[PDB]
């Protein structure tokens, strides 16, 4: 906008008359310098060469987007427009920094959108939907980045090979948010694997205080994790998130150790195989979590081998299943 | 067949130099397996081509070649139009055109005619180049000859950006012929290869091209002096040893007097 | 049968030569780095 | 067949690696000599 204004001002009658007067007196130094020394022609040629990229740069849609689908659509449009960098002169490093800026804006937009969702006041299925959309957005970023990357390799293979500089790896700011969201997904997947079946574990076969205390402790750990803003990618939020995760691990470890004391009491009580299988059936969630299985490994040599010694039908396959949990054919020992 | 490669190289070094092209082409038909390798080692007189866009003579080499095409230094275009080609660079192209102008001036000052061509390409943390000069003797005078010079320079730019190291290897193929009343016909062919390394401070006052040109002219003067003095006076000495203008009786008398002189000197020490 | 065997031997020789070349490249890089630091400090004090 | 082209490609890779390794070794020796000579000269200047 300013270069075209200066170009208009250069063509004005007064400036042209001044240049003509100077040319009349054989002061050609000024006229030739004004033609070339200004650099206005080179600057105009470069800014016009940059014109296709800046002309239709669609970030207004992304900055105005408030839904994950709209953010994905805006990202796809942004990269479809960056596809037009082949016929626009632009430094490769500068374009890479521009992509970093786009990543920063994407991180800010995702943070603002997910902040408004109020994840505490809603259930887990919608949480899975939200993270599915978020990681779909991240995968769209990844594959559109890959397309732009192969395009940039093709572009830099032409023209200068840029032998002075080969550092081009990007440091997206949004990947730090992606990692945090992945950690939250893993934490809540483990939490659901606990929650959805520990109530079944503690359910009497159709009310004690240990069940209420354990469920209350699990919910208290969930609330302690939730009080910390998990989306806060900055340093202090990250340290608070680590502290909350450590406290959750401590509480779950304490509860699991109490359940392991119960597991020792199982062998303290049962004497034959049938009572072992009965008290195994009472406890289903304990088969999947990768801490109780060591205790199961203490009992397997007593039970499974014995059951094998009994075999060497469908009732006995049920006996084998009750020690290996649901879907007993998946285990390495259940294959045989 | 490295032994056969050495055989072919020695034979080509032994044959006369004027028929180097024809005899090399004939030898290619004998053992073609090493032919391109031979063409990498054997040095050949250069070829002239017409850049029609600018209307210039440019020299064909193996460094500007890309398949079956030769890149001009002025137009920066291959004489056969290649849809895909290896341009040197943006910066190295300005270095190339600056070198072309500088070496056109040098050729005009030292040769007064002929053709020149500077082709640059990039190199590991630096750049290499080849400066080719050709100069066919004009037909105005009885002297008829040819001069070819290929100077391959490698510039290793130090990290500081002020210092650089130049490695120059130059080959000169010379041919002269004179038909005078007394000498009747003399035909002096020859070839000579030399090399040298240096390091110089790159600066605005002393850019790369200045250093390369200084090295090239120093090598050219050294090769010219050596060819004129050592490698031609040796042939003069050989021709003087094959036959004696003075009679051998007079030479024997002079040598007897010389023996008397040296024994007298040896006695008084 | 013999073809795949010679691919194996030539691959062994090729990876050995490539590792030697990469080691030479690393030595060249170290020479460049130490040259940079030495030249920097010595030209500074000069 | 295709395995013959594999033989040929591996041979090209082997000879290219050998040539580049020889060039790297000679360049490393040359740059070491350049470094020590220039260091001697610059120490004399200092």
């Amino acid at each position: 906008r300013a270069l075209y204004r200066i170009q208009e001002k250069r063509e004005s009658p007064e400036v042209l008359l001044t240049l003509d007067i100077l040319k009349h007196g054989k002061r050609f130094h000024a006229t030739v310098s004004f033609d070339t020394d200004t650099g206005l022609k080179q600057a105009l040629e470069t800014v016009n060469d940059y014109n296709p990229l800046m002309k239709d740069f669609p970030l207004n849609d992304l900055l105005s987007a408030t839904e994950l689908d709209k953010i994905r659509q805006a990202l796809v449009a942004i990269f479809t427009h960056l596809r037009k960098i082949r016929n626009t002169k632009y430094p490769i490093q500068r374009a890479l920094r521009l992509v970093e800026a786009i990543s920063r804006d994407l991180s800010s937009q995702l943070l603002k959108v997910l902040g408004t969702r109020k994840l505490m006041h809603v259930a887990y299925e919608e949480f899975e939907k939200v993270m599915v959309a978020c990681f779909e957005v991240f995968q769209t970023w990844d594959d559109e980045y890959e397309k732009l990357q192969v395009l940039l390799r093709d572009i830099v293979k032409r023209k200068r090979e840029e032998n002075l500089k080969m550092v081009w790896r990007i440091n997206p700011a949004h990947r730090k948010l992606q990692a945090r969201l992945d950690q939250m997904r893993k934490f809540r997947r483990q939490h659901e694997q606990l929650r959805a079946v520990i109530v079944r574990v503690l359910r009497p076969q159709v009310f004690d205080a240990a069940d209420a205390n354990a469920i209350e402790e699990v919910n208290l750990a969930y609330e302690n994790v939730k009080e910390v803003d998990g989306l806060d990618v900055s340093k202090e939020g990250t340290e608070a998130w680590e502290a909350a995760m450590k406290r959750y691990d401590e509480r779950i470890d304490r509860v699991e150790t109490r359940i392991t004391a119960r597991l020792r009491d199982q062998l303290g009580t049962a004497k034959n195989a049938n009572e072992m299988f009965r008290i195994f059936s009472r406890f289903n969630a304990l088969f999947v979590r990768p801490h109780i299985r060591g205790a199961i490994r203490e009992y397997q040599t007593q039970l499974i081998q014995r059951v094998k010694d009994d075999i060497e039908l469908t009732a006995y396959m049920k006996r084998v299943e009750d020690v290996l949990g649901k879907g007993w054919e998946n285990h390495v020992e259940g294959q045989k | 067949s490295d032994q056969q490669l050495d055989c072919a190289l020695d034979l080509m070094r032994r044959l006369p130099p004027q028929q180097i092209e024809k005899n090399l082409s004939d030898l290619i038909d004998l053992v073609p397996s090493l032919c391109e390798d031979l063409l990498s080692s054997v040095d050949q007189p250069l070829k002239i081509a017409r850049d029609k866009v600018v209307g210039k003579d440019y020299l064909l080499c193996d460094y500007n070649r890309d398949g079956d095409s030769y890149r001009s230094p002025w137009s920066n275009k291959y004489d056969p139009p290649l849809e895909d080609g290896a341009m040197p660079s943006a910066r190295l192209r300005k270095l190339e055109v600056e070198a072309n102008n500088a070496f056109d001036q040098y050729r005009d000052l030292y040769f007064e005619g002929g053709v020149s061509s500077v082709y640059l390409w990039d190199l590991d943390h630096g750049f290499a180049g080849v400066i080719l000069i050709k100069k066919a003797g004009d037909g105005s005078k009885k002297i008829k000859g040819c001069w070819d010079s290929i100077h391959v320079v490698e510039v290793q730019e130090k990290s500081s950006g002020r210092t650089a190291h130049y490695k120059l290897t130059s080959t000169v193929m010379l041919w002269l012929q004179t038909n005078k009343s007394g000498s009747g016909t003399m035909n002096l062919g020859g070839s000579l290869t030399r090399q040298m390394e240096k390091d110089e401070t790159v600066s605005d006052c002393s850019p790369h091209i200045a250093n390369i040109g200084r090295l090239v002219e120093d090598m050219e003067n050294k090769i010219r002096s050596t060819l004129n003095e050592i490698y031609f006076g040796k042939t003069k000495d050989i021709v003087n040893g094959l036959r004696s203008v003075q009679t051998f009786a007079d030479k024997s008398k002079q040598e007897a007097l010389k023996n008397d002189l040296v024994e007298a000197l040896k006695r008084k020490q | 049968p013999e073809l795949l065997s010679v691919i194996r031997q030539k691959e062994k020789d090729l990876v050995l030569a490539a590792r030697l070349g990469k080691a030479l490249l690393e030595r060249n890089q170290d020479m460049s780095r130490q040259y940079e630091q030495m030249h920097k400090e010595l030209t500074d004090k000069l | 067949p295709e395995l013959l082209s594999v033989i040929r490609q591996k041979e090209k890779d082997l000879v290219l690696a050998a040539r580049l390794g020889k060039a790297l070794l000679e360049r490393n020796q040359d740059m070491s000599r350049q470094y020590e000579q220039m260091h001697k000269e610059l120490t004399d200047k200092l």
């Binding site: 090979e161 032998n163 080969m166 | 590991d124 943390h125 | 090729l14 990876v15 490539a18 070349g21 990469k22 490249l25 060249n28 | 890779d13 290219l16 690696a17 580049l20 790297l24």
Partner: peptide, 14 residues
């Protein structure tokens, strides 16, 4: 060493 690196890069990928 970019030309050298690219030749190694083809070998490293394969």
């Amino acid at each position: 060493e970019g030309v050298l690196a690219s030749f190694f890069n083809s070998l490293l990928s394969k």
